Design a protein around this nucleic acid. Sequence first.
DNA 1: CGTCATGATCATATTATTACGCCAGACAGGG
DNA 2: CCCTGTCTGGCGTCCTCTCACCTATGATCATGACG
Lengths: 1316, 251, 66, 237, 81
Amino acid sequence: VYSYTEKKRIRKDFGKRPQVLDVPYLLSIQLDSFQKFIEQDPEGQYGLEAAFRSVFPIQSYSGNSELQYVSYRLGEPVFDVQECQIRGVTYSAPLRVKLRLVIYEREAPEGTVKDIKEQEVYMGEIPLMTDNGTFVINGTERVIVSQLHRSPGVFFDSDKGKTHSSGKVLYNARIIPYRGSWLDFEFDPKDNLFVRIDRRRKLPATIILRALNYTTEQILDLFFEKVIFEIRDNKLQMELVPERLRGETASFDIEANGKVYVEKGRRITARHIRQLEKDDVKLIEVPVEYIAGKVVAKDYIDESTGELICAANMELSLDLLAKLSQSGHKRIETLFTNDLDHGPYISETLRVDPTNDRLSALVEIYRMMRPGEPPTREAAESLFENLFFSEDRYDLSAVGRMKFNRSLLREEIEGSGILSKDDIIDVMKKLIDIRNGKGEVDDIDHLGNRRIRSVGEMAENQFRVGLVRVERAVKERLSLGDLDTLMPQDMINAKPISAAVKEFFGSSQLSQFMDQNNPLSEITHKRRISALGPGGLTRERAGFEVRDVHPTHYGRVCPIETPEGPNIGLINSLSVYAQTNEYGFLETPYRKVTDGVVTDEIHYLSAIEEGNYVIAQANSNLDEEGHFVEDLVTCRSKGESSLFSRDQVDYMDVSTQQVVSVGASLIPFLEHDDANRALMGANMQRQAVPTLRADKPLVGTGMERAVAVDSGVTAVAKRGGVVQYVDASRIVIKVNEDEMYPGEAGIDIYNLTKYTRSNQNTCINQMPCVSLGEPVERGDVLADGPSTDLGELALGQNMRVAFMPWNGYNFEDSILVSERVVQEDRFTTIHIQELACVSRDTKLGPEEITADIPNVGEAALSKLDESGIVYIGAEVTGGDILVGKVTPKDSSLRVPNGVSGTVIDVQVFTRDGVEKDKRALEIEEMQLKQAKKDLSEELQILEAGLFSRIRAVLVAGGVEAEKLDKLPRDRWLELGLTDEEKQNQLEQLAEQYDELKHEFEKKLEAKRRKITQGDDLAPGVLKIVKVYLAVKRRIQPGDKMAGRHGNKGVISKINPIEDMPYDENGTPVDIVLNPLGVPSRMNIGQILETHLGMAAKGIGDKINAMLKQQQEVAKLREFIQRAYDLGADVRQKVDLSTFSDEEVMRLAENLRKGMPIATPVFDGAKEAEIKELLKLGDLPTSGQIRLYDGRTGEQFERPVTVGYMYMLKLNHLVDDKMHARSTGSYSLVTQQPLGGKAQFGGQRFGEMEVWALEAYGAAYTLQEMLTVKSDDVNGRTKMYKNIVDGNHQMEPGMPESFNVLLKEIRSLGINIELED
Amino acid sequence: VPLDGGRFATSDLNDLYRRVINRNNRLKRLLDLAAPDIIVRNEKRMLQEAVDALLDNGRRGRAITGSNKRPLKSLADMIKGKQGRFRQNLLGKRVDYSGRSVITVGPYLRLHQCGLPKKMALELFKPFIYGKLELRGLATTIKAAKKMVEREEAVVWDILDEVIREHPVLLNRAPTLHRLGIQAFEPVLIEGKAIQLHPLVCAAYNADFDGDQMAVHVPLTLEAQLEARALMMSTNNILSPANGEPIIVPS
Amino acid sequence: GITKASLATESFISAASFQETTRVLTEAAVAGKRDELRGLKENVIVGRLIPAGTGYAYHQDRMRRR
Amino acid sequence: IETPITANFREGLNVLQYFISTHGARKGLADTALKTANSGYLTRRLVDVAQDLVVTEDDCGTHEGIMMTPVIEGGDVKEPLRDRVLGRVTAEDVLKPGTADILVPRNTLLHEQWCDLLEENSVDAVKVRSVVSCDTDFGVCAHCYGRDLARGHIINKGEAIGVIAAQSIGEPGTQLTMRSSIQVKNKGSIKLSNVKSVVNSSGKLVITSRNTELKLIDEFGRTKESYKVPYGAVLAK
Amino acid sequence: GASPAIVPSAVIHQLSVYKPKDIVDPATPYPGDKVIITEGAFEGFQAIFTEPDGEARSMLLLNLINKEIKHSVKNTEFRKL
DNA sequence: CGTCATGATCATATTATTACGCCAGACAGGG
DNA sequence: CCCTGTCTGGCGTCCTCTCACCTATGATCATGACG
Ligand SMILES: [Mg+2]
Ligand SMILES: [Zn+2]
C-alpha cells in the first residue's frame, strides 16, 4: 500500500537487494547528544549532573562552611525562535539552580550545623537547540560540529626507525587521561627506561615506583623471575629450569645423573630441554665463572658485623661470594637477564637512579614539576597525591577506564577514574613485553582509538571550566565573611559561567556558521566529523597518515565525501547508517549470519568488534532463504579483503548504501565514476543554489525523501487528517478522530515561512503543495521547502543535453546553453540582501533619520516617504537612497553600486526612551494589527473545531435536529442530556473554552507588551533600520553550472534558439557539453545518467501523447503498468488495479513531464535494463539520435548522444566576482589601495608577478606598477593630472611604505639611513 | 582603528608602549622616594622584560598576550616573515587601475586580442575618458565629465572605443608559475561580464574554464605601453624559455 | 646551499627579504654594512628601475656618469 | 593487494572494489596538496638565490668550458648530442677525425644546421662554454650563456637570466613525485676504462679493480652502452 | 628566581619606620602643579591645581589670552596628571 | 529628617600545556 | 680537547570570496522610599 502523497507520483525503482533496515533519522547525533546533555538525569552521569556533582560541594578553607547541591531546572525562554532571529538575541534558557548552605560548629565537623539555607539561584544562560539541530547565537543560525579525537586510555606507540639514525626502534606508552596530567613512559638507545610528565624534563622511570612506596627488593620481585643457587658441598650448585636455556651456548659440559647432557661449545636444544624436564633434573653444577655477572635481587646483611654484604641489584664478584659464603647464607637469589627473553631494563634503570627511598623520589618529582624551590615532605606528598591519585585533578572517564582495562587484557571494564599502583605497573609490564618481542604496537588511525565528541560533551566541559573558576571564587567569599547573614546568591555570580559557555558557543574552532543554502547542505553540515579544533591536530602542521582512509572507515566515515584542498581527510563526513556507541566510538549495523541462514536481525558492531569476526560483503547473491548461492564469497577478515567459504561467515552488511554518506548517495550511477570525480560531484552538490521553480531529479537514488523529510525545510504533518484551509501563508489540518486527544479539541495550524533571508543570501521559501479537502497521513509533507518538490529533493533542473564539439565555444570545460533555457525562467534564482543603518550617538548632538535633507532634490526624495525610510515595494537601482541620514553632513544609506532590487521588508528597532517617528508607529500599528488578527483567528479556528466536536458528540444521546441552531452557538451545553460521558465531555470542553478565553486575554496583553516595548541595543545607538533588497539574478555568460559527477564549467555563450542542433523531430537541444572531458576525467556515470534520463523522458512523452489525445483510463492503465513492471527481480512490484480510475489520471498528470526513476547507489540499473526501457519508448537503442545543424541545416555525421542530464547552478556567479578600480580609497598606515570588493579595492600585484616582470625586460611597467600606481602619493597625483591632460609620463619618487620600513627599523636601536 | 561601537580595539604596539611607560614611570617614582636597600631590582627586572616584550616578543621566555591565547605583535613581528613589511607591502603591492573577473572562451579572437567587458573597460579607463572629454570639449570641468561617465550617456562609448584601440592590457592568472603567466593583449569590448580569452593562449596559463579567474592591469605610461607591445605581447611569446618547444600547441 | 648562499651576500636587503630578518639585520648592524642596491630586488624594494631590461641601459648611463 | 579489481567502469564496481579505489584516490589528492606546498617554496628559494645575475658583458675571453657527451645509463642513449649541444658557444674548436682539419671555429653558436653537421660526422664530444666557468666580474657574459631561449638569436645584453632560470626549474615542481652480469644489446668495438686486468689459467681476462667501466664503441666513434664493472669480475672478452 | 631574593635581616629593620618625607608622590594634585583637561567645553588644553574642594570637586585653572576664570570640577570630571 | 536599599554607571589584565617535522649550528656531556 | 648528544632557533604556496567576533562583572555613589 502507499501513502497518499506516494500515489501522486510514485518513483520508478530499480534495485535488487531487498532492504531490511531503513535509513535512520539523519540528525540523530546533534539531537541525541544535546538531549543527553540537558535532561533531568538521575544516577549521577551523564549530563549537567556530572559537572554539578563533581565540582560540588564547595567546602571552605577550614571555616566549617559548605555550599552543597540539590537540583537544577531550566525555565522557559523569554523569546521563541522567530522573534529571536528577528531581534538578534541569543536563544537561551535561564539555568536556575537550587543551592544549599550549611555551616558547621566548633570541635565537631561531625556535629550539627546550626543553620541551613536552601534557595534558588540564577547562573548563566545556556543556549537551547532548535528542532532542526542548530543554535541561534546572535540571530545567526550556527552549528556545533562533532570532533574526532584520541581515545583516553593507555596507548603503546613505537617511534620507528627515525631516532638515533641506527634503526633501533623506541617504544613509548602514553597514558591519555580524559582530564589531568599526561604520562609518557619510553626507552632510549642505551635501553634505559624513562618516565616523563606532561612533556617536561625526563627522569628514570623507577623513580615513580619508589614514589608508590616500593622497596627495591619488591621491585625486582615484580619485574623479574628468580634463579636459585644452593651451596651444597660442591661448586655452589644451581636450580635449573631448562626453558631459560632455549638457544643459549653454555660455558661448560652440563652433566647430571652421571650422564653428559650438554656439551661445551654447543647450545641447549629443545629436545635436550625435554630430556632434562623428563628426567626431572633439579640441581646442576656451575663453575666459578658462571656467577661472575649474575645480578643479585635483595640485600644480604652479615649477622656479625651488622653491615651490608652486597647491595640490591648488584652483580656478584669473587670477593662478594667469599663474604656471603662465610656469613651463613646457602640460598642465593639472582635474576635472569637474557639477550632475547628478558633484558635488564629495570636493572639498568635502577643503576642510573640516584634516589634511595620514598622521600628522595618525591623530592625529585616535586623538583621536576616546579623548578628551583625548597621541597617539603608535606608538599611532595600533596603534589604526588594530586597528580594522579585525587578525584579532583585527575579523571579518566568511563571511556578511559574501558580502554585502559581492554588494552591491558583485564576483565572488569568498570573501575575508578583515578589510577593506582597496579595500573602503572601493568603499563610498565606491557611496555617491557612489547620490547621483548611478544605482542604488538597500536596504530593511531584505527577507528577503535578515535572517539567522537559532540555538542553535549563539549558544552559540559566548557561549563565545568566555568564551574572551577566559580569554585575558585566561592572558596573566596565563603570563609572570609560574616555568617550567618548571607544567602547563596550573594556569593556565586553568573559572570564566569555565562562567559565560558557564551565564548564556546560564540567563537570556538568548532562552533561554526551554518552553510545553509540547500537542504542537503544543512543535513550534511550537521553530520560532520572534524578532526581539527581543541585537542586535535592542525592543518598547516600534520600530516600524512591522518589524511588517508584507514581500512576501518568501512561503514562509519564516508570515504569519498571530503573537501579537497588544504584539509582533505580532516573534515571527514559521517556515513548514513553510522550511529555513535555508548562511549563515543562509531558503530554500524550488520546482519547476524547464523551458520546457514542470514537472519534479519540487525546487530551493531563497533570498530574493534568488527576485526575479530568475518563480515560478508553487501551485495552477495542469496536465494530467498539466506543460503549463499556461491561457495566462495568475497569477505574481509581483519582489515584485509579476501575470498572465504560459504558458512564461515558471521555477518553480512545491511544495505549497499552504507559505505557512503548522504552527500554522495544522491549521485546516481556512483559505481561508474572514478573516486576523484565522485568527490568533486558530492562537494558541488553541496554547493548548489535554489532556483525559482525546482523541478525533480529524473534519475535519482530514492534517497531524496530521507534528505527532504529528515531535514527541517518542509512542513511535516504531526497528526494526520483532512485539510480545511490552504493558503500561501497558512495551512489548516483537521485531525482525524482516530488520532485525536479527548480534550483540547484540536485542529492544527501550520504557519509557513514566506520570503526571508538565509545565511548565504538565498531565498528560503515554503510553498503549499496540498489541495483542499485532501487527506493526509501522519508523517507526510504538506508544504515544500526550498529546492523540494512534493517531498522530494530537487536541487537543480533537468535539461536536454548533447555531447558534441560545437565550434569551439565549449573548449576546456565550458558549457553552451540555448536561449530557450533563459526564456523559460528556469535558473532564475532569487537572492536577498540585508542592508543595515544605525543611528549612532556622537558629539554636537544625535543624528537625524528624517527626510529634511540637504544637498538633495526631488529626484532622490521621490522614492522616500515623509520620514526617510524607503517604501515597501519601491524597485530601486544601484545608488539610490534607502534611508536618509544626516549628522550634525549627508551620511544616508545607499544601495551599494551595482545591485538592483525590490525592497520587500523594512524593520525599525528603537532603543527605549527615543521618540518613535511616524513610520515606526506605522510598523507598530501594523504588527499590532497582524498579531491581533492572528491570535483572534487562533481563538476562532480552535473554537470552530471545538463546536465541531460538540456537534460530533451530540449526534447521539438526546439529539436535537432542529433545536440545535435556534439558540446562539456559545450555549451548547444546557440541552437535554443526563449525567453521562457526554455532559462530562461538554464540561471538559467548557473548561477548555474558558481557558482559551482567559489565555487569549493574557496573551494579547503580553503581545501588546512585546510589540510596544523597546529593545536593548548597542552602546549609544538610537534606532536601527534594516532593509531587505530582493534581487532576481537570472543567468549570463560567466556563471558556473555543473552536473552531479564533477563535470564543471563556465557557461560561455547563450546562443539563440535557431543555432541549436535539432533532430529529425524538430526539438532543439538545450545544452551542448564537450565530449573530451569523459576519457581523461573518468566519470563515465554521466553518460549512463544521460541515457537513462532519455529513457525516462521517452516514457513521459508517450504518456503525454496518450493523454493529449483524450484517451480513456484503460490505455493509460495498460501503459503505466508496463512501464512500472519492466525489469529483473526488483523491489517495487506496484499494481494500478487498486488506484480506482481517478488517481491514475492524476498520477499521469504528474508523470507527463517525465517519469522519475530511482537508481540506488551500488545496486543500480544495469545496461540491459536501460536498453529495455529505451525499447519501451520508441527511442533508438544505442541512445544516439542523428542531429541536424542549426546554422548550415545539414546533418552532423556519426550520430551524437542526446538525453537529459540533471544540472545544478552553483552560487559562484559572475556578478559577484567581477570588479574594477581606477582610483578609489587608500589605506592609512601604508599608503596602498585597500583589499577586497566590498571595500572598493585593487588586485594584489603579488610577488611572483614581480618575478615574472623581472623575467622579461619590462622595467618601466614594473616601476609604475610599484611606485606610481600603488604607493607614492605625490607621484600618483602628478600621474592623474598627466593622464587627464594627455601627457603619458610618470614622476617616480619613492614608495611611502619604504619610509614606513625606515621608521620601523629606525624605531629599534638600528640607525638606517640613505647615503649621499 | 575604531570598530564603530564606541570603543577602540587598539593595535598591539600602543599596548606595548603603554606597558613600558607605566613600568618606567613607576620605576622613576620608586627611585625618587628611595628604594628599600636590596629592593631597587625587581622593578628594573620588570622594565627589562617589558622592553624585551616590545622589541621582539616571544624570544625571551613565555610571550605576553592581550586576548586571549594569541601572542601580540612586537616590532620584529612587523619586520619579519609573512604579514610583514618586506613580503606583504614592499615586494608585492596592491595596485590601482586593475580589475578581475571570471574567464571564458570566445574562439572568434585573433591571438593578440582578448574580450573584456564594457563595464570593466569603462571603470579601468576612467581618466583617459576624462582627458578625451575635455580635449574634445564635451565637458567644461572635470566634475561634469565625471557625472557624464557616471550616467553613461550615449557619447562616452565612442570615446571608449577611441581610447581602447591600440592600448594593451596585462592579463594575469593568479598562481603565476613561470613568466608566460603575465601576457599583454589588445582589448575588444564585450557585452557581458566575463573576459573572453583566446583558447591556444590557455596552454601557457595552465587554465581551464571551470571557474578560473584572471586579473587585468592597465599600463598607464607610454614606455609601459611599448613594453607591453614589444616585449610581452601574446604573439611574441610562442616559445617557452625552458626549451625550444612551442607553447601554442593546439590543445 | 642555496638558502645559505642567499643569506651570505654582501647586500643586507636581499638577505633580509629572504629568510630570517633578525639575524641578517643584527649582523649587518654591528658590522656597519653598506648596501649599494646591487641588482634587482633591492631596486624593487626602493622603487626604481630594475637593472635588467630597459633599466639596464639606464643603469649603464647612470654608472657612466659617475 | 593480492586480489585485483576485475571490474571496469563500463560495468559496475561493487563496494569493496570502489573502497580500494578510494584508497588510491585520496592518497593522490593529499600528494597534490603537500606537493604544491613544497613546490612554491622551492621556486621562492631559487629566485632568491639567483635574483641578481644579469647578462652584463659580450665576451668574457676564456677557453675552459665543460664537456658535453650524451648521457648513457646503460641502455638506450637517453639524451643525444643534438639535444645537449644545441645552441651553445664551443670551447675548443672541433676537429673532425681528419686531424688538423677544422670543422667549426672556436666561437660559433651551434644552431640547427651545425647540429646536423655534428650528427653526420658523428662528433665525439663538443667541448662547450658554460656559465659556471665564466670570467665576467659581477655578472655573466653573453657568449658563455648561449642562445636566447624562447627566441632564435644569441642572448641580448641585459636579459635577467637568473630569474628565468629559477622559474624554469621550479615551475615543473608541481608535476613531480613526492613519496649479476652485463647484457649487451648492440654490436661494436669494446672499450675498457680504469681497469687493472690480468690473465687467469682458463685463458680469459680477469679484473683486479672496482673502478672498471666497460663501454661499447659503435661504428662511427661514439658510445651506445656503458657498464660499471665490479671488483674482481671475470670477463669473457 | 625560583625562590624569593635572599632577604637579609637589614632592609626589614630599615623599613620599620620609613616615609619620613612628606606628600611627595608622583607629582599629581598639589599646590602648584599641572593637569590636562578631558571633559567639558573648556577641555583640549591643560590647567593648574591649588585649593580643591575635597568630598565634592577641586579647582581648575581656566585661562585664555590674559584673563582667567576658575571653574570648580571634581577630579573625575578633569584628567588628574 | 535620616538611614537603608536598590539601581545605574563607570572602571582594568592566567584566577587562584599533551595530535609536526627537518635541518643546522651552538652549547654542553662523556670520556 | 674531541667527539656526540641535546637544545632551540629557523622555515613550511598563491590569489580571491564569504561569515562572525572585537566583554562583562564588581564596586561605589546617588536617589528614593519608608520609618
Ligand atoms: Mg580547473
Ligand atoms: Zn664567459
